[PDB]
Structures are given as structure tokens and as C-alpha cells.
Write a protein that binds this ligand. Sequence first.
Ligand SMILES: Nc1ncc(-c2cnn([C@H]3CC[C@H](O)CC3)c2)c2c(Cl)c(-c3cccc4nnsc34)oc12
Length: 296
Amino acid sequence: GSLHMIDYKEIEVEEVVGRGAFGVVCKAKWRAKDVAIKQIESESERKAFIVELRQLSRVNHPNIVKLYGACLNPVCLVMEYAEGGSLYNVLHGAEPLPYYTAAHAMSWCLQCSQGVAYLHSMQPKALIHRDLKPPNLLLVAGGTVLKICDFGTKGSAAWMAPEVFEGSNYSEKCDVFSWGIILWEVITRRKPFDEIGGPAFRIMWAVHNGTRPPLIKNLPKPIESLMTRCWSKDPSQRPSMEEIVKIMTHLMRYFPGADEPLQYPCQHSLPPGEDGRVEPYVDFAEFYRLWSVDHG
Ligand SMILES: Nc1ncc(-c2cnn([C@H]3CC[C@H](O)CC3)c2)c2c(Cl)c(-c3cccc4nnsc34)oc12
């Protein structure tokens, strides 16, 4: 593809607002627009930043961060300012948190799978994200549109597929695992493996021994079936991202209201405990009602 060259002097750097696998992301201004820039911290991570630039120049999809351009001296990527911040911050951040619906949960997950499916279909060689997690999922358009960033490629163990820890030959299917865990997280509004805690190796041992997030009380069987297939030990038993897109696209018939912006506050006491099954944050009553009308 191609990249728009940008003069660094034309960029005005405001406060630092995030930190990826490498570099540091900041809020900024450029040419009568709000923008997010991503500068290098050191010369050691220059080669990583160039490969990211070469990949981002090729990608073009509604659910991947728009890259306006780049600077070469100093090295930095100029991106769209995601108004809504990260998904992580919307789910778990500082109060007041926003109210969201099952429809938002499923729409977010559909949009993520749409973006990952585009990367997995890239020719000649597929782009694997390798680090899919809510801190890398940004929200725009009042919290209704989701976008993937920091792709290609620590603190990620909770979303990372077992075969990746093991140093084993891995594939596209590592992102399907991550997506599975993200679906649980948006439905429950819970940090996965928060109760295990400790350092990263403790979650890695857990997940390697078969541990997965608890099942969700009253979760529709079609959604429970997709979720649990996504986090199989064997990556060949997980569905492709193309299959996830189709299934999730079809399910959205029963989840209307995904285009409503997040505007209501939420007072939070998500009921912990009850070992084994957990309660969802979102409500499925409307799902079951609409399903029944179509089926019986
Ligand atoms: N393009 C982007 N636009 C906006 C943000 C971002 C996150 N929080 N916030 C603000 C939003 C307003 C709130 O009052 C205070 C937090 C903006 C962010 C953030 Cl954070 C990242 C980010 C995080 C991790 C890795 C990575 N790679 N490329 S961009 C990126 O990109 C952003």
C-alpha cells in the first residue's frame, strides 16, 4: 500500500494517554483535527515500528484504526483519536462507568471478529494479531463502533492461547481463543482470572492445566457453544474467524439496538462469589423473546 508523510512540526503533542507493546501513545492536534500519535521511546524499537508501519500501510477496514500518516524524523504513527477510549476502560475503568446492553456486547464482539477475519484473509501471508485484548480495542461513535489497534506485535496472559505460552508452533487460531475470552468478558463485565491473580506465570499454569472462565448462568446455548469451542486446548477444534463472523452476524437479528450510544451511568455492585457459575452483566430476556417469535 502507501503512507501519507507528515511533518512533525505540524503536530502539537498534548497529554500521554496509553502504552502498547512498544512505544507510547499520546493525544495530539494536526491540521484542524483531533488525533492520536505514537512516538518511539528508544532507538532499540525502531525496527518493530517500521514493520508495523509497513503492515498498517496495507490494511484498510472499518474495524481497524485509521492511520492518517507517519513521520520519519522522529519516527511516529498518526492515527484517529478514538473518542471513547479503550474497551478495557469502558468495561473496568474509573467510575462513572457507562451502562451497556447485550446488544452492545454482541456488536462489539462481531466488529472485532470482522477486523480479525480481514487480517486472517490477507494475501499473500495472513496477519495474526497475537495480542487481542480489550486494552487494544478502541471505541468510536458514542461507543457503538469498535476498532482494533496494536496488531502484528506482557500483561496479556489472561487472553493468550496455551500454545503461545508453550513456544509451540501456533497459528491464526490463537486470536480465536483471545476472542472467546473477550466474549466472556463483555457478557460478564469481569476481568478474566482476576481471582487467580499473582504474577503472569500463575495464570499460564492455570490455563495450561485446563482452567477457563466460569460458565455464565442463563447464557443462551448457541452463544455458550461458540464461546467454549473458541477456548479449546486443541487449536484445530476452534472455529475460524470467518465462521465466527457468519454466526455472530446471524445472531444479531436477536440483538437490536447496537447503534444506541453509551449515555447512561451505571452504579456498580456486580455480585461476586457463588463458585462455579457467574451471573452475566447483560440481560438475555429480549434475546429469548425474539428467538421464540422466529422459532416457537
Ligand atoms: N487512537 C487512540 N485514541 C484514543 C486513545 C485514548 C484512550 N483513552 N483516551 C482518553 C479518552 C478521554 C478520557 O476522558 C480519558 C482517556 C484516549 C487511545 C489509546 Cl489508549 C490507544 C492505544 C492503546 C494501546 C496500544 C495502541 N496502539 N496503537 S494506538 C493504542 O490508542 C488510542
